Design a protein around this ligand. Structure first.
Ligand code: ATP
Ligand code: ATP
Ligand code: ATP
Ligand code: NAG
Ligand code: NAG
Ligand code: NAG
Ligand code: NAG
Ligand code: NAG
Ligand code: NAG
Ligand code: NAG
Ligand code: NAG
Ligand code: NAG
Ligand code: CA
Ligand code: CA
Ligand code: CA
Ligand code: MG
Ligand code: MG
Ligand code: MG
Lengths: 330, 330, 330
């Protein structure tokens, strides 16, 4: 049957087109792929002055709110903190969140099994005028985090500038690339701000813009903490010039339920010696967690992948022809 | 032969069964896979008081034994330390491990090529009553780690509480999930402890339980340090409801031979100014290294993967039928 | 035809040889593969004395130039720094890089939008004898990083010793391995330096040797900063003894163009209290960024991968025979 022959030829044409069109070109089979080695470097430029009630103005610079000062892909930017100054080790009252005692007989000498705040001496001392707490041994100024200021202390950190330095290199092809490209020059970085469409190559990122691109409001993240995920893509083709290789930045919002465990927070201390006595300052920092992940793939022409793809295409064409013959045979 | 025909049918059915079940149901081939972006948040709530000989009691709160206070997937929990207080720079004796001198002629001015402890002045000073060491320019109180206390100083860190907050999101499906599943509530986290069977969803992990589940003893590990690997896997099917997404916590023991380089240790210093002189406190912290790695995949029904799997199954079926025909013809 | 059959037999033999020769053995199709759980531990040794102009000799031990003292795969080794001591908050002049004012009317009260150094009070004060800068509210001693010393301060860090402790464990096969192997003993670690050919198993890496193996000169990296990428490979076969499993170290140079943002640098501060006044020391550290990434694969004999590879080879052989028959047909 002439019609049957035409159908067989048509099937052959479709599969032949598919192997050259998709496997060879869309999937870039003629090229080999390998991994890269990336190093993330971050730098902040911003200053926020927070005036605490009953205390002098406090100046914070890049070294203050950037706790990973050495440089890492995962860093926290301080936006709100609770300061407990002049802490000293001694016998004093604990926080009321642990327990409330009405007499000395209720207190038990020892340490709490869960959420321990210190070594209980065994006496009930008044925490304030109304309630009384157990007497413990340790830092007497307790971190009273029951009251969180609604206005963010470091609210100026919204429209600051963030610089990300990423250098990637493919060991198979021995090609090294950096986030700074030929289009980006010295004068450009002096005034550019990163944008999704306008300035995709500007390495100066705005914290508020980064938070808004992920889908989160900066006010709540500055108040109670947050997590922002940043991803850098390096998919490119090595057949063209290295100028075409440009990184693509994507921002993802990592958030959960607001009722249980809202935001991100931690604690750190600064130990010092004043008047011959060891003292420290404890801070409950509510900062935004920034995570940077780099992943990319590069392809360059090679003969062995091309031959393997040609063989696979010939095999698929043969299998398709045999299946078409079996179907036409019925 | 009727029997030969039956054999052909039997092979044909079994290959069809394999494509129908293993390829689909088991492998979720009709479902696409994509990576996730994860951010690890850790918080400790424990207190240990160490009372060394010759010094007052020292209280170590969360800000003390957690050196990565900012928060990272890789953190060290202090369990044992060697304190060398009131260090000041000057010309004084070195450690006996560097070298032993019997006269001033044996000492050579300069710096040691390997394991240098300071700049030698060229004089031999007595380290103690018996032996003499080279005079170097550096911190006079030399950390002598020859004696390691068998009882762990921060031995209370065994049954403390560790909270791990992990937020994962898939960019392909735009679905965000957190380790705090809907089954876990606020009252549940107040008194729950993680267990493989009892409480698999409780985000509160006990350090001693984590060490026991890794095939290690907490005492011998904390005596000299160690490394514990924690892996969180997110294997869920997006075809069902989002409540089915439940993280899996697995603990792996990363240990080596104890005869060569036992445990894990490091050194850090706290710089301060006392009486107009710059001093510091050096600690050789023997702590357990905790590494948290998150890796998971998601699967949702899609048309293109389903069509590709159907085509591959049809091709495999045709190839199997042709091979059976060729074998039966011989 | 005889020659046609001879050519056919030859081709079928060649494909059969290929499947057993390459897919089965070269590719180790029979074995199953899985990932590992790695944990990098680093420890530095060495001392550098930087005698600054008009200041006493400063001793820098391991805890000083190693900012990630707790231990991490990504760490920075200090090689050059700019010290700005005795910083205190107050009203004073700013850096000339922010702006130059000739009168008090030019200054505007508030904070700079980009590269902010403090809160301007609206007054123009002379920074030095020649030029005048805006008056800000913050740390009065400004980090004047216009002059970078050409000789590296911590130039002794070139030929120091770096020890890397890596423990990997395959969860599928329950096999734990460490960078220390049976060939490496206690006496060997006392005196050895890592080499590409001589000492591939010595865990003591020289910083200068690591920098030179990556293709970068250590002098420029100590002067203005640099990034060095280290990779550890754990490809091995579990069919043999565990002694054959040996790590392979590869060093990669991560660098960019020298005109725009050359090297790596950061800033950190050490807070202290002297004479009842809060002070700090700011340092602009020019250090080399070391990134350690571990990846490996282990294979062990299994029956299911062997059967799948045999089936795939039989299918490929059948497809090749069918294609040969079709070619011989016409
Ligand atoms: N977070 C940031 N915001 C704005 N500009 C930045 C930021 N980080 C770096 N830059 C600019 O990029 C240029 C090149 O970066 P480089 O690593 O040389 O910084 P630097 O000059 O060492 O730092 P500094 O400008 O504080 O002296 C610098 O002129 C710097 O001003
Ligand atoms: N290591 C831990 N052990 C036990 N419980 C913890 C731990 N970390 C956090 N939690 C509890 O989980 C709940 C949610 O965590 P969240 O991040 O809100 O801490 P928080 O309430 O801000 O800290 P705090 O309880 O010190 O005020 C809190 O009630 C907290 O007490
Ligand atoms: N950077 C380094 N260069 C050379 N040798 C090192 C280095 N770090 C550690 N080592 C050696 O490796 C051996 C085992 O390491 P381990 O973790 O036991 O150190 P340690 O003995 O606790 O510390 P230290 O050697 O400072 O007393 C030690 O004998 C140590 O001297
Ligand atoms: C005392 O502290 C408790 C702690 O919860 C608080 O409820 C109470 O209002 C405090 N009383 C005064 C007078 O501050
Ligand atoms: C937003 O950016 C502008 C810069 O034009 C700045 O003046 C302003 O303070 C920023 N907003 C906040 C809340 O910091
Ligand atoms: C600086 O870079 C920008 C990139 O947007 C480019 O448009 C501009 O021409 C560059 N300047 C010079 C002087 O090359
Ligand atoms: C002196 O120090 C050396 C150092 O190893 C030690 O062996 C010796 O016992 C010490 N002597 C006394 C009396 O402490
Ligand atoms: C074990 O946990 C209990 C809590 O029930 C605690 O009292 C005890 O101190 C813990 N053990 C150690 C060695 O800390
Ligand atoms: C709290 O969570 C637990 C999970 O084990 C659940 O059994 C319990 O019902 C929850 N409590 C409430 C009040 O929902
Ligand atoms: C004053 O500071 C400016 C800042 O750039 C500098 O150019 C100038 O040389 C300085 N003058 C003196 C006398 O140091
Ligand atoms: C190179 O190593 C030698 C050790 O033999 C050391 O003396 C020398 O100071 C090192 N060079 C530098 C520049 O530190
Ligand atoms: C120490 O290890 C080295 C490895 O190069 C080996 O040659 C030497 O024999 C070992 N020493 C002892 C005492 O086994
Ligand atoms: Ca750190
Ligand atoms: Ca001090
Ligand atoms: Ca890290
Ligand atoms: Mg609280
Ligand atoms: Mg020692
Ligand atoms: Mg500058």
């Amino acid at each position: 049957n002439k019609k049957v022959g035409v159908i067989f030829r048509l099937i052959q044409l479709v599969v032949l087109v598919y192997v050259i069109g998709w496997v060879f070109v869309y999937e870039k089979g003629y090229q080999t792929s390998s991994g890269l080695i990336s190093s993330v470097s971050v730098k902040l430029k911003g200053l926020a002055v927070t005036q605490l009630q009953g205390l002098g103005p406090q100046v914070w610079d890049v070294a203050d709110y950037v706790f990973p000062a050495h440089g890492d892909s995962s860093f926290v930017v301080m936006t709100n903190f609770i300061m407990t100054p002049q802490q000293a080790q001694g016998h004093c009252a604990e926080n009321p969140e642990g327990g409330i005692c009405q007499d000395d007989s209720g207190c038990t000498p020892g340490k709490a099994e869960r959420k321990a705040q210190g070594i209980r001496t065994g006496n009930c001392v008044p925490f304030n005028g109304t309630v009384k707490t157990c007497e413990i041994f340790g830092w007497c100024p307790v971190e009273v985090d029951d009251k969180i200021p609604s206005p963010a202390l470091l609210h100026e950190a919204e429209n600051f500038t963030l610089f990300i330095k990423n250098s990637i290199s493919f060991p198979r092809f021995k090609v090294n690339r950096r986030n700074l490209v030929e289009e980006v020059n010295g004068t450009y970085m002096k005034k550019c701000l990163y944008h999704k469409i306008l300035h995709p190559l500007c390495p100066v990122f705005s914290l508020g813009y980064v938070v808004r691109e992920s889908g989160q409001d900066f006010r709540s993240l500055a108040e109670k903490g947050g997590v922002v995920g940043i991803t850098i893509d390096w998919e490119c083709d090595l057949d063209w010039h290295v100028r075409h290789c440009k990184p693509i930045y994507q921002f993802h919002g990592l958030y959960g339920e607001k009722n249980l465990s809202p935001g991100f927070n931690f604690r750190f201390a600064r130990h010092f010696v004043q008047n011959g006595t060891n003292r420290r300052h404890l801070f409950k920092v509510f900062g935004i967690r920034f995570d940077i992940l780099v992943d990319g793939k590069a392809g360059k022409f090679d003969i062995i992948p091309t031959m393997t793809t040609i063989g696979s295409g010939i095999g698929i064409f043969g299998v398709a022809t045999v299946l078409c013959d079996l179907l036409l045979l019925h």
